[PDB]
Amino acid sequence: LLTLPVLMKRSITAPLAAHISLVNKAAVDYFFVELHLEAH
Amino acid sequence: LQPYRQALLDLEQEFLGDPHLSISHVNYFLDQFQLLFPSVMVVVEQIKSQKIHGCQILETVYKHSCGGLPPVRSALEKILAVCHGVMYKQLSAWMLHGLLLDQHEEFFIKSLKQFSLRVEILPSYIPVRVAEKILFVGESVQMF
């Protein structure tokens, strides 16, 4: 009737967190260059 | 109870499908089930009086599955396959994903607390020699 009941409901949605982690990695540059924040 | 239901539909196509019967044939035809039911009636009367719970029903089932009568030893075998199903589900739940899904219950596993082997409510036919192994891989997943 399901062989992973709670165990892997989240695992269907969990590649979203990978997209998020990429968008996050693509958030740092705006401050590193579009500001030159830490050079300031 | 599917066998009893089947063996009670199979008379419906005679009590008005064969225009005369006498209850001597009925008494005989259902005398097969005169044997099985009190043997499982004592099982549910044991449950209703002993307030059995959790996996501590698998001992009652497996006990009276040692009654030598082959019909009874098949009926309570087919109950036993279902309930092993459940405890297998709980054990598939816990061991690869660290999930003690055992709400309001005991699946015999009570940081090491709620990660402690109960053994009062543990099946007699399952040893502590392997329950210790279960508990250890359970704490293993809990720390990764």
Entry summary:
With 40 residues, chain A is mainly α. In chain A, 57% of the residues lie in helices and 0% in strands.
Radius of gyration of chain A equals 18 Å
Order of helices and strands of chain B: HHHHHH
For the sheet with most strands of chain B, the description reads: none
Strand content of chain B: under 5%
Q: Which range best describes the helical content of chain B: under 10%, 10-25%, 25-40%, 40-55%, 55-70% or over 70%?
A: 55-70%
Largest interface: A-B, 5 and 7 residues
Number of helices of chain B: 6
The fraction of residues assigned to DSSP E strands of chain A is under 5%
Number of strands of chain B: 0
The count of DSSP E runs of length 2 or more, i.e. the number of strands of chain A, is 0
- CA distance, first residue to last residue of chain A: 59 Å
**Helix-strand makeup class of chain B:** mainly alpha
Q: What shape does the CA trace of chain A take?
A: rod-shaped
Which structural class matches the secondary elements of chain A? mainly alpha
Task: Indicate the percent of residues in helices of chain A.
Answer: 55-70%
PDB class: structural protein
Keywords: gTuRC, gTuSC, CM1, CDK5RAP2, gamma-tubulin, microtubule, alfa/beta-tubulin nucleation, cytoskeleton, structural protein
Entry title: CryoEM structure of the gTuRC-CM1dim complex
Chain A: Gamma-tubulin complex component 6
